[PDB]
Amino acid sequence: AHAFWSTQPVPQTEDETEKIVFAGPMDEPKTVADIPEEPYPIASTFEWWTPNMEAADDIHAIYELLRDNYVEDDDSMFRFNYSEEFLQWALCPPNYIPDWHVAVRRKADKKLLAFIAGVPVTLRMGTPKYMKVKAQEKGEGEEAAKYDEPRHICEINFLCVHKQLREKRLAPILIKEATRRVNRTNVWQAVYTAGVLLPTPYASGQYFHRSLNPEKLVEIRFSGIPAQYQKFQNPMAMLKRNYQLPSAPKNSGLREMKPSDVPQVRRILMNYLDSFDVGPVFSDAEISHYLLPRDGVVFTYVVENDKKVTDFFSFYRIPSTVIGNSNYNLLNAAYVHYYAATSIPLHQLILDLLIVAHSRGFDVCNMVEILDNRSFVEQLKFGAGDGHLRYYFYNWAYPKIKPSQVALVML
Ligand SMILES: CCCCCCCCCCCCCC(=O)SCCNC(=O)CCNC(=O)[C@H](O)C(C)(C)COP(=O)(O)OP(=O)(O)OC[C@H]1O[C@@H](n2cnc3c(N)ncnc32)[C@H](O)[C@@H]1OP(=O)(O)O
Ligand SMILES: [Mg+2]
């Protein structure tokens, strides 16, 4: 059933997953010296290319590949259109490794055919709380604690094969080469997400959406007018009223984050993320990188009153190409990123996220049911969407956890 995934160090079934009780490696690691120095073999007419994702023309080349060939819905109405600025941001965090950005080009015509990217992440990925209790109940605490310390691993994203090259087994070649480059830096796990089901997730969450411009969403067929609204004389007017938001934020002291806020935002975020079983650890440089505002890309606000930052939220932008509509070309989506609340309830903080995103021209706000995102879904009028975001590890046995135990936002 899986000619590639059955050869890799990942749990193969839910039955196998059910038996895993401690975090730890699937394959005990070899060493860097065991790993082939040369690139994996590839057809003599293709070639490996490492783009420089800080050089505007290489970022452009990868942007076009994704624009035209990255994730689309099944009805081919929308295709992700991650921006050049977003790609530089996402792919070049502190201490990134350029050789983890892996592309394939056609030699003749130098056509870009495929891409995959890895970035460093420091991840807490030790045995989860409910399995540590089960280990205590049986006298197995030290085996359960072995990998408690945060681990320096790879996060994988942006796997893409050109539409003309689909179903030719090029994705396993990209994955094997990326795994070799990561292993040659002495890293032996990765984390990745996908909307598709592969062997075998350690967590799964539904997607949720909050309409900000319902008229546009219905015009482009992202949304429909729900049947309940047909009993009104003006169904669209009532749908707009249902989703209407204030025109300015309600929390006193909300302002954009600035460099001087990095230590306090790091402290409150890390204290909050500690409560989840799987979650990132960020240095001050990584809090700067992932959270300071960047036009068009990431938007972050703090609540500061009386000279103290007590709360913050962030969101990032990913537009989608709208294929074939004579009134709009783009779906402008805001995605809930990290946040922490110490002075106000989460729904009160996140209401200001929706207000700011709507004021800035976003059409919808999206998130998955990770972190404490379930705690504000009803009041803030999120609804579950179709499908599910699955979280995976490469070369890590992990007991299944609920998505409310996941604190890693995947871009
Ligand atoms: C230690 C370091 C480790 C580093 C690596 C860690 C692992 C990272 C893994 C990557 C994490 C990526 C995270 C993201 O970026 S998820 C976003 C993935 N990208 C897209 O959906 C964009 C549009 N689609 C495409 O570009 C292609 O359809 C892709 C590239 C997805 C497959 O190309 P194609 O359709 O031409 O097929 P093939 O003949 O070449 O290959 C067929 C094989 O590929 C397996 N497949 C299909 N979809 C995925 C998928 N999303 N993750 C993993 N595997 C996938 C499939 O089950 C089959 O294997 P098997 O079933 O036969 O066994
Ligand atoms: Mg292929």
H-helix or E-strand containing 387?
Answer: strand 383-394
Contact (CB, 8 A) for 316 and 298: yes
Contact (CB, 8 A) for 179 and 87: no
158 Cα to the center of ligand 2, angstroms:
15
Task: Tell which atom from ligand 1 comes closest to the C-alpha of 196.
Answer: 51
Task: Tell which atom from ligand 1 comes closest to the C-alpha of 189.
Answer: 1
Residues in the chain: 411
- CA–CA separation, 321 and 311 (whole Å): 34
**Nearest Cα to 122, choosing from 252, 308, 320, 287?**
287
Q: Which residues participate in the annotated binding site for Mg(2+)?
A: 165
DSSP 14-71: HHHHHH--S-B-SSPP--GGGS-SSPPP--TTEEEE---TTSHHHHHHHHHHHHHHS-
Contact (CB, 8 A) for 190 and 388: no
167 Cα to the center of ligand 2, angstroms:
4
Q: Is 59 in the pocket of ligand 1 (CB under 6 A)?
A: no
Indicate which residue's Cα is closest to atom 53 of ligand 1.
198
Q: Which two tokens stand for residue 369?
A: 């049911």
Indicate which residue's Cα is closest to atom 61 of ligand 1.
2
Contact (CB, 8 A) for 362 and 170: no
Residue 113: which domain range?
1-411
Q: Which two tokens stand for residue 360?
A: 């800035």
Are β-strands 151-161 and 364-368 bridged in parallel, bridged antiparallel, or unpaired? unpaired
Q: Can you say whether residue 21 is alpha, beta or left, with left for phi > 0 and alpha for psi between -120 and 50 degrees?
A: alpha
Domain tally, the chain: 1
Contact (CB, 8 A) for 365 and 357: yes
Compute CA distances 196 → 6, 82, 199, 399, whole Å.
Answer: 16, 20, 10, 20
125 Cα to the center of ligand 1, angstroms:
23
Contact (CB, 8 A) for 65 and 164: no
164 Cα to the center of ligand 2, angstroms:
9
Are β-strands 330-341 and 364-368 bridged in parallel, bridged antiparallel, or unpaired? parallel
- CA–CA separation, 80 and 219 (whole Å): 18
Q: Is 169 in the pocket of ligand 1 (CB under 6 A)?
A: yes
Domain containing residue 116: CATH number: 3.40.630.170
Q: Which two tokens stand for residue 306?
A: 């009386």
Place of tokens 């094969």: 161
Q: Which residues participate in the annotated binding site for CoA?
A: 2, 4-5, 161, 167, 169, 171, 193
12 Cα to the center of ligand 2, angstroms:
22
Q: Which two tokens stand for residue 87?
A: 């790609």
Give the determination technique: X-ray
Residue type, 75: D
Q: Burial level of 222, CB count in 10 A (0-12/13-18/19+)?
A: buried
Residues within 5 Å of ion ligand 2, judged at the Cβ atom? 161, 165, 168, 170
Mutate to test the pocket of ligand 1, among 4, 113, 159, 169 (most ligand atoms within 8 A of CB): 159
Q: Is 157 in the pocket of ligand 1 (CB under 6 A)?
A: yes
Catalytic site residue 411?
A: yes
